Design a protein around this ligand. Structure first.
Ligand SMILES: [K+]
Ligand SMILES: [K+]
Ligand SMILES: [K+]
Ligand SMILES: [K+]
Ligand SMILES: [K+]
Ligand SMILES: [K+]
Lengths: 573, 573
């Protein structure tokens, strides 16, 4: 069909948290008489129109379509362009944190008795999304694509009946502010732009369609651009309908419920249809967290090349770093939920800074790319991108110069990631310049000893493979607290074996024996090799509790020694 | 010297949380007119006297001295005796959780501005104790032994000056209840015994001196018994002094501060000496969490024998399961802090149930051991242990029949641990009966092939070791997205090599090639062996980002195949 839902779930889920909650909280904490919801909503829609035309330009200029990092690096260089990668990391961590925190704030308003603990509902929803991305690995075409349609039709029919109730001359909240003009004391243009900055976080979703272009099965232009156009107009009318209903009634920002909850409550009764609205909004915020997890590894893959991430992300979702990426994203999301509670009123400036550093850098890089050449309608596209850069930059600077008590994790976390990316690049240059040389051949050692550490079928199998693979093999076993080691040697010899054994009488005597046999290795020009066994079950749960003592301990011991180890599996059946 | 501090830190740290906070909370939530602090404190001291004489009996009967599990198993059997192990696990998890939660509740009363977030101070203190037990591994003789002395002398001089202020005829809180008699309506004997149960958790520390007997360097009897006697009398007079001061003033249980904070505040001003009391009480609660971590692995070692835990705990602190034990204890402590907040008002019945299942089972097992024989003063020791069992059992049943909204993790978590211990014992019996047989020798395969997966110094070293160790060796390398594989074979051959190569054109073609070469292994009676390289750095941080793609992926691939692998280290220098 179409399948725009895996990206529209990140886009149009912001009609619940960063729209009326944060904006109306700032307007009430000024003077408790708000009427600037409609002009700031129109200003946010104007900034949305600027961003959707700028990303139409970026998609029409890149059919490859990797947005917000590749353009920044290739049109800014190295020291910038990489900060776009760091801020997309902060945006991914915070989109799963903020989407889950607003999901719990919209699920502890249908059943408000469990609002005492709602930090450990957030960690539970992060954990079930992390599990269903790890072991389930669904990525299906029904569960990820039906609730966005249900949400759009649900909020549409709610906006229809709510504007119908606000119409036909009926008052449904007799307390109501003015309509036109009537300024209120204690309100500056600085505070109005403060509310415009904090309420600008409704449009943090178009980055998802600019960062997840491929698998369209058509020409890339004129199709994904029109998908982005439909998503932009749907977010526009949805956010405008929710803010015109919240200005329509009283709708104070109560510190236990959201704004869409109060809209549904005073619109269509307490509990008849209201439960499907809170249900579908919790589901949509959960799917937005899933889109954050799903769009992590494309950034990780675009940064693994050019030697900035660990190298393991080069396979693009063939399960190497997808596990480590999912675990890191979940752990940083959980520690941010813990540091900020299940609040979704403090994390919104963090998430907006994390999404409006990449918009700024992407627009500046597109501006420099359009100032490099003058091909086709030059000054118009240049002014569109530069004005978008200006308005995103003033949004970032307003969100940074205040709320500085919450955005200290960005100022800490960004130079750590930039310094680490520089260190990984320097390390891979040093490895590529020290390694990849032309040398000679070694001694051609022509002789190898095989060491193996009760008389057991696995022990006799491993010592048979030892005698097959080499000669002069040595069996050892650690002996303590009794006299049975002489009895063990006795029953060994007169039961099965005739091979050589040199027992001992824990780590320290073992590394002493290995150091002595390494002393009998260098001038003798003969190498050394230790063979281990491994017990392998069938039920896949007994990976623990069988071999993870000797294996882990002696593999930890077997560094700085230059002795090759080997494992032989038994595979219990 | 003496060094009783590593156990007295768990014992006499309970003068801050489970003494006046919980007891006075229950007494005020009845009727807000409490005078039953003194009789319930005397009843708790009588139960302390019973427990200290019963543990003097257990220590005098066992110079080996492993308490609360070994006596329960060897005098009750298997299905009981093991529940003592499960409840000591719940007691260790909850002693680190409750000690850290009371530590934060006593550090957000000296500087109360940071009382907004005090769940993430608890996780930070659990993490710094987990780190200082993992990598630091201090176990010193000054940092773990000076603050217990400082705490005892601090609370002693505070109790001295506070009773001096309550004396010399001066009122320091003009609101004061009655002294003798004067009953209050809304108070039953059921609620008085409820307060006795919830306030019985002051004496949850003598288990630490009953579970950590050795390293005394003397005769075991008459020395550790007198150490336990001094600890018992110190907890007795300390808890009695704190409760007589809290009855001396008003001392309501305010929901932001502790009881020792209000005692110090109305006793010796707001901030002159009061900061050293809150400092030393936070330090002592931190050291009690450290004692929980330190006394985990002795239980783990007494349960690893007799085939109930994973086998890796047999070395008794030689760093095998000490890491996994510390990580599990920290993770379960953190998830209990998260589920219950930084409250230390809900977790106290959980921790008291977790400490009063083992006291009950230990006293019942000692009673059956003293009913087996009639050696020396039979009926007196029998009645002492049976009365201790009765009073601990009624404390457990009162704490279980109410506060059932908080002790559902015990009723869930205990059959899971008992079922898992039964499953591990059954699994080791099945392994011991299927393995350890007498069989014949295999084919004596007499021929082995060596497989190794750019032309590199590590590649040429590994292929030289391959040619040295065996013949007919095969080099493979995965080839994709270009034509250079023919160029790679070309430059391989006319640059250095003359060995055999069979290239291919990710997991699926690799396991196809391994399945085909395994098909060329069985009727041919020749085995197969894959050699890997490993890059080893010097700075110890580059364990990641070098080899953890191919190693992890293909070792995951190399199950169900019966093919021995081998790693060869480079060790960058
Ligand atoms: K979202
Ligand atoms: K985003
Ligand atoms: K996104
Ligand atoms: K404690
Ligand atoms: K204990
Ligand atoms: K303890």
């Amino acid at each position: 069909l179409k399948a725009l839902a895996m990206l529209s779930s990140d886009a149009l889920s912001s009609v619940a948290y960063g729209t009326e909650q944060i904006l109306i909280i700032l307007a009430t904490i000024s003077a408790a008489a708000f009427w600037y919801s409609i002009p700031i909503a129109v200003g946010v829609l104007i900034l949305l129109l600027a961003l959707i035309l700028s990303y139409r330009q970026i998609i029409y200029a890149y059919p490859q379509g990797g947005g917000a990092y590749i353009v920044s690096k290739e049109n800014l260089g190295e020291k910038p362009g990489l900060i776009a990668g760091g801020s997309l990391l902060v945006d991914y961590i915070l989109t799963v944190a903020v989407s889950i925190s607003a999901g719990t704030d919209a699920i502890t308003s249908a059943f408000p008795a469990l609002h005492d603990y709602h930090v450990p509902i957030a960690i539970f929803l992060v954990l079930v999304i992390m599990i269903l991305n790890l072991r389930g690995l669904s990525e299906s075409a029904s569960i990820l694509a039906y609730p966005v349609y249900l949400f759009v039709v649900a909020l549409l029919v709610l906006i229809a009946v709510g504007l119908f109730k606000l119409m036909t001359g009926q008052i449904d909240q007799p307390a109501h502010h003015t309509s036109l003009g009537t300024p209120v004391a204690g309100i500056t243009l600085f505070l109005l732009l403060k509310a415009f900055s904090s309420g600008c976080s409704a449009l943090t979703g178009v980055e998802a369609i600019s960062n997840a272009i491929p698998a369209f099965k058509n020409p890339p232009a004129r199709n994904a651009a029109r998908t982005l156009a439909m998503m932009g107009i749907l977010l526009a009318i949805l956010f405008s309908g929710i803010t015109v209903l919240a200005y329509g009634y009283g709708t104070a920002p109560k510190p236990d419920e959201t704004v869409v909850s109060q809209i549904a409550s005073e619109t269509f009764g307490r509990n008849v249809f209201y439960y499907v609205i809170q249900g579908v909004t919790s589901l949509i915020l959960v799917l937005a967290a899933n889109t954050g997890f799903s769009a992590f590894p494309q950034l990780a893959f675009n940064l693994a090349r050019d030697q900035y991430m660990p190298r393991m992300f080069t396979v693009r979702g063939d399960r190497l770093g997808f596990s480590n990426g999912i675990i890191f994203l979940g752990f940083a999301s959980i520690v941010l939920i813990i540091l900020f509670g299940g609040q979704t009123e403090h994390l919104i400036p963090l998430y907006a800074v994390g999404v409006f550093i990449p918009f700024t850098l992407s627009q500046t890089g597109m501006c420099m790319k359009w100032i490099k050449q003058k091909p086709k309608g030059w000054i118009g596209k240049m002014l569109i991108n530069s004005c978008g850069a200006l308005i995103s930059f003033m949004v970032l600077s307003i969100l940074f110069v205040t709320k500085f008590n919450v955005v200290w994790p960005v100022l800490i976390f960004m130079p750590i990631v930039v310094l680490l990316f520089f260190a990984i690049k320097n390390h891979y240059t040093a490895v590529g310049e020290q390694l990849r040389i032309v040398d000679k051949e070694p001694e051609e050692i022509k002789g190898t000893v095989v060491i193996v550490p009760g008389v057991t079928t696995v022990v006799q199998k491993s010592i048979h493979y030892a005698k097959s693979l080499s000669d002069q093999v040595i069996a050892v076993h650690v002996s303590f607290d009794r006299e049975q080691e002489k009895k063990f040697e006795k029953r060994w010899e007169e039961l099965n074996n005739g091979v050589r054994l040199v027992t001992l009488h824990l780590v320290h005597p073992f590394d002493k024996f290995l150091e002595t046999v390494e002393a009998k290795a260098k001038k003798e020009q003969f190498s050394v090799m230790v063979l281990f066994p491994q017990f392998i079950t069938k039920k896949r749960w007994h990976t623990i509790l069988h071999n993870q003592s000797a294996f882990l301990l002696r593999v930890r011991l077997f560094w700085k020694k230059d002795i090759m180890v080997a494992t032989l599996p038994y595979h219990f059946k």
